[PDB]
Design an enzyme around this catalytic site. Structure first.
Site, mmCIF file in Angstrom:
data_model
loop_
_atom_site.group_PDB
_atom_site.id
_atom_site.type_symbol
_atom_site.label_atom_id
_atom_site.label_comp_id
_atom_site.label_asym_id
_atom_site.label_seq_id
_atom_site.Cartn_x
_atom_site.Cartn_y
_atom_site.Cartn_z
ATOM 1 C CG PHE B 289 -13.763 0.840 5.573
ATOM 2 C CD1 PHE B 289 -12.549 0.843 6.241
ATOM 3 C CD2 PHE B 289 -13.780 1.053 4.202
ATOM 4 C CE1 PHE B 289 -11.352 1.069 5.544
ATOM 5 C CE2 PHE B 289 -12.594 1.267 3.498
ATOM 6 C CZ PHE B 289 -11.379 1.268 4.174
ATOM 7 C CG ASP B 290 -19.018 4.621 9.744
ATOM 8 O OD1 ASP B 290 -18.679 4.160 10.848
ATOM 9 O OD2 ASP B 290 -18.773 5.785 9.392
ATOM 10 C CB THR B 291 -20.968 0.797 4.426
ATOM 11 O OG1 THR B 291 -21.602 2.082 4.417
ATOM 12 C CG2 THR B 291 -21.822 -0.213 3.662
ATOM 13 C CE1 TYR B 374 -17.139 11.862 13.169
ATOM 14 C CE2 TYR B 374 -18.947 13.460 13.553
ATOM 15 C CZ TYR B 374 -17.585 13.171 13.306
ATOM 16 O OH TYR B 374 -16.661 14.193 13.224
HETATM 17 CU CU LIG Z 1 -16.529 15.179 10.642
#
Ligand SMILES: [Cu+2]
Ligand SMILES: [Cu+2]
Ligand code: NA
Ligand code: NA
Lengths: 620, 620
Positions: B289-291, B374
């Site tokens: 959950f990057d955020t 990423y």
């Molecule tokens: Cu991807």
């Protein structure tokens, strides 16, 4: 030198001379279509032979002809008389458009309809529209146009603001007789003007926009040789132009290391249909086949530098034939340029300490056409990473009607009393594929959801499946956005370094297809538009999804007839036909001139390369 | 001046001082989140009161706190102790990430696992990843990270090329204990390097790219005042920045003649989840959950002129707090610039003789973040014609694994022995709507097909239907691309000149939503991701679709709990939550660094204006 070079003025002049001396181009004759034929399949084809295909109309009523001529040898190869009640009428001629308004201007029924509405006949413009095939038996085998009326208050007025609803006329443009005038009742003619250059409507022009200057101080990165051969950032292709299809891309290939690898043999927009969804008998017959009936190439705009095409622009000026066989140049008809396209790849790595950013670019090939009230831009894009994309841009003025007092389920209101009938704009892209050569196949790829259970104890797994389309009878496919459906075109005989077949993935926008009832005339004549994807086996004479003669053809021509042959398409020379379109419920903001809306598709490499193809792009 | 101004270094330092004075920020405390609170509803309200929300972690194991502070008044407004086993752990601290690799390097189980693989511990990098909630009862109430190993052959090597499959470790980052080391067997470590700046892999760099120069001789067309207030081509807005959400847009409005008309009160990406679809126990827990868990604004890049942002760029440099309450500037973290955007509108009219072309442009507000392998770009666009669009750009290095010898249904092969597990990247846009003010409603619009028959005798008609969503219980909606489904946000009390309610139409990309089994842990924690559209009644404390504390939090918070209140949303202050995402089956071309792929959404006016809003754009 190249067989794919643009037709020249001299070639068209020679065709004219050959036809005239053969007795095929008398004063009753009109050229309705003229175009160069592509080379036949032949990897050992060497002898130069430039051939042209011509449709010849006869204004005195004799049967039309289809003629093939060799410019190289100065000979007529074949000439066949057409039975238009069987195989369809020839495309509409530009000179027939004026005939409709002039014939109606002296017809007593037309004049009585205008007199009742207190309209001056000298101010009434008539849009001459294709007829289709409906219930009128007397129309079979005759060239019919239907006319809808608009009032022009003064010579610079936008007549589209003033539709004359409740009135339609049918005209035989060969015998020059008005066959029917239908008056279903008086509607007020909308009174507001739609003049988008009138300061009273625009208000004061903005003074807030500052210039954006886009220049290439060293010139562009692409080269143009032999008139229309492009080399740009490993891409190689030829830019063709046909009066029916417009810009056609040939021989799209990518230079991967030492090898020129083919991707697409021929890419074009092979048909475009605009069906209207208003059940009023004034418009329920209205369906434009802009490509097949009108020929979008012959109405291409001259594109002005700094306005239509901004930056360092290289123009092509294609030549077409007029109705008498004289060459006509479309000056600045095709724009070519490269554009910055933002970030290509970027990563900031904590462990290695390397920060890496590269920028993307695309090559743009575009032209713009105008058919009556509508204007369409056709854009092909080539990207650094191997992506190919097409985009259509729709603008112009929406087609109008009265807005009925008690509302409507099929027309939106744009201004007091002014309606815009619901319609679609549906395109067919014909992609003659050549992924690493001609032995290709198509797979349909769906996402696969998996159920929590043994081997998936946490319920997180998901997968995908691919289904090979092996015969034409199973190659008529529908979109499924919910399952992420795409189609892969691969070469089963050409593997990447992982021993997987090389391929390209088609990504559709998954917009609605043709909405008309399956039993309707338009569903029969535009059958291609009822499904998202078709795959056929290549054949020389299967050029258009609607057949060769679309005008007033009763139905079934083109893709349904081709697919019925049920040919093998599993590792063969195949053609992909992709249907895509816009469904337009006009909004107030579309009036009085419509901001651009867009639709398209793209193809991305799918294991075509052995790794990213843009590792050699510099930081600059 | 403005209550929506960016937080200043002085405000952050003052929050530190207020917390210290209050006894809440001693040496054992760390700031896990700090951000400015938006003004409460009420035009004017408290003349000036800047409030900050703080999550305070305690490294000694004591309970963390949520604290609200008034920096204007120098006061703690409220401070509550959190029971994290109930309501969730605080977001991961940057200092906790580096703990994991250091702890594992001295654990005998880890060392034995690496020795079995002949790996040198000094060359093994550990990716520290969020833990989620699974079957391990000892983790409840503890701060856990899970570690996956990669070999770095030398300091500049891309470790992502060399995953160590079959091995995972779990670490308590507060007590500094390795709780579990799981070794399911030895896999070969892929040997090929992935060093995309190594000339051995890139080959000689291209010399073919000629420069593209984008300049603005008179400067940009937008103005920035008060640090972050933007005026551009009739648009007005404030650009905020929050350490969790990143760029936030406030008070989006359009100047229509004399009136400033609101459109969107607050727009943000309020969560993003990256679920992995590999059922291997080594990775079946993997969901970012990057955020919510990592805080994407914290990892924003500094953007370099000419590489990241090209043209005449105006930068913002937002200030965030470090873990001790000191201000930290993200230099050049936000790029702002305008871009040419092709043709806006074009028509060449035969009857009037007027030829008309105008060009479009868009305002771009963007930032980029890096979380591990990423990299994500977040782009907001405003167009001349009233369109608002968001675009996410995904790039970076794909997360890797071994490729099993017999193949896999859930992993792609990128290089010999090297796999990339299937996964999704799913975003939630929170749009606090204010179409002409706060009295708004949402309608779902579907195309309606009509049957041939009475009133539709030619079978051409088609229509549309709109369904008002009146209560939260009926406002959880799914996409339907086949029926052209869109959603309209309108103001039933503000009508255009045709007496129709003004509105904006939301156009989705209709990509697949969350694929995991509905019973899975990730489906419960990311319930928002299972449906395309949610509408809630505005409430001050309903900020994120996953709730306030996402890290190691089970289901129970967020959108499903909000919707249960079943509040009236028919002409009320409402919030639209739109789910959209990419489903990523990695391709060979994604390796060794991924070309950008994109996803987004847009909103277009739908009878908001009385006619086209761009009639006053000049020709230039
Ligand atoms: Cu991807
Ligand atoms: Cu339209
Ligand atoms: Na082919
Ligand atoms: Na609201």
């Amino acid at each position: 030198a190249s067989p794919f070079r643009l037709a020249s003025a001299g070639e068209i002049s020679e065709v004219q001379g050959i036809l005239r001396t053969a007795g095929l181009l008398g004063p009753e004759k009109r050229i309705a279509y003229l175009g160069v034929l592509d080379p036949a399949r032949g990897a050992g084809s060497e002898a130069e032979d430039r051939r042209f295909r011509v449709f010849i109309h006869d204004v005195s009523g004799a049967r039309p002809q289809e003629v093939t001529v060799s410019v190289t040898n100065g000979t007529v190869i074949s000439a066949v008389e057409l039975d238009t009640a069987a195989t369809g009428e020839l495309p509409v001629l530009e000179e027939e458009f004026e005939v409709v308004e002039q014939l109606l201007a002296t017809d007593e029924r037309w004049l009585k309809a205008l007199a009742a509405r207190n309209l001056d006949v000298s101010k009434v413009r008539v849009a001459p529209l294709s007829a289709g095939v409906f219930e009128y038996a007397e129309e079979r085998g005759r060239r019919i146009l239907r006319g809808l009326a608009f009032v022009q208050d003064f010579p610079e007025d936008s007549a589209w603001a003033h539709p004359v609803d409740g009135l339609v006329a049918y005209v035989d443009v060969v015998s020059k007789e008005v066959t029917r005038v239908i008056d279903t009742g008086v509607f007020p003619v909308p009174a507001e003007h739609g003049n988008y250059t009138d300061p009273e409507l625009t208000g004061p022009l903005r003074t807030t926009q500052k210039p954006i200057s886009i220049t290439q101080p060293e010139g562009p990165s692409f080269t143009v040789t032999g008139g229309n051969h492009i080399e740009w950032e490993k891409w190689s292709l030829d830019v063709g132009f046909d009066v029916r299809e417009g810009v056609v891309l040939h021989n799209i290939a990518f230079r991967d290391g030492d090898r020129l690898r083919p991707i697409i043999n021929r890419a074009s927009i092979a048909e475009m249909v605009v069906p209207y969804g208003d059940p009023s008998p004034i418009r329920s017959w209205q369906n434009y086949f802009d490509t097949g009936e009108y020929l979008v190439g012959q109405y291409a705009n001259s594109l002005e530098l700094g306005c239509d095409c901004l930056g360092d622009i290289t123009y092509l000026s294609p030549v077409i034939s007029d109705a008498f066989g004289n060459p006509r140049e479309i000056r600045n008809g095709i724009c070519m340029h490269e554009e910055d396209w933002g970030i290509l790849a970027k990563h900031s790595d904590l462990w290695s300490g390397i920060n890496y950013t590269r920028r993307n670019r695309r090559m743009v090939i575009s032209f713009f056409t105008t058919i009556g009230n509508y204007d369409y831009g056709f854009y092909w894009y080539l990207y650094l990473d191997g992506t190919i994309e097409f985009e259509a841009k729709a603008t112009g003025v929406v087609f109008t009607s009265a807005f009925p007092e008690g509302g409507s389920d099929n027309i939106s209101q744009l201004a007091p009393g002014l309606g815009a009938p619901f319609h679609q704009h549906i395109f067919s892209a014909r992609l003659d594929m050549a992924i690493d050569g001609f032995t290709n196949r198509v797979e349909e790829e769906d996402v696969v959801r998996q159920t929590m259970g043994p081997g998936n104890e946490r319920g997180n797994a998901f997968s995908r499946k691919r289904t090979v389309l092996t015969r034409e009878s199973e190659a008529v496919r529908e979109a499924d956005a919910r399952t992420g459906r795409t189609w892969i075109i691969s070469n089963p005989e050409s593997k990447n370094r992982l021993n997987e077949p090389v391929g390209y993935k088609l990504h559709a926008h998954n917009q609605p297809t043709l909405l008309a009832d399956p039993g309707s005339s338009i569903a029969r004549r535009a059958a291609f538009a009822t499904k998202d994807l078709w795959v056929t086996r290549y054949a020389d004479d299967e050029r258009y999804p609607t057949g060769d003669f679309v005008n007033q053809h009763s139905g079934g021509a083109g893709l349904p007839s081709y697919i019925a042959q049920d040919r093998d398409i599993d590792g063969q020379d195949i053609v992909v036909w992709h249907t895509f379109g816009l469904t337009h419920f006009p909004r107030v903001e579309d009036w009085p001139i419509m901001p651009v809306d867009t639709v398209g598709f793209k193809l991305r490499p799918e294991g075509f390369f052995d790794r990213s193809p843009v590792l050699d792009v510099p930081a600059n």
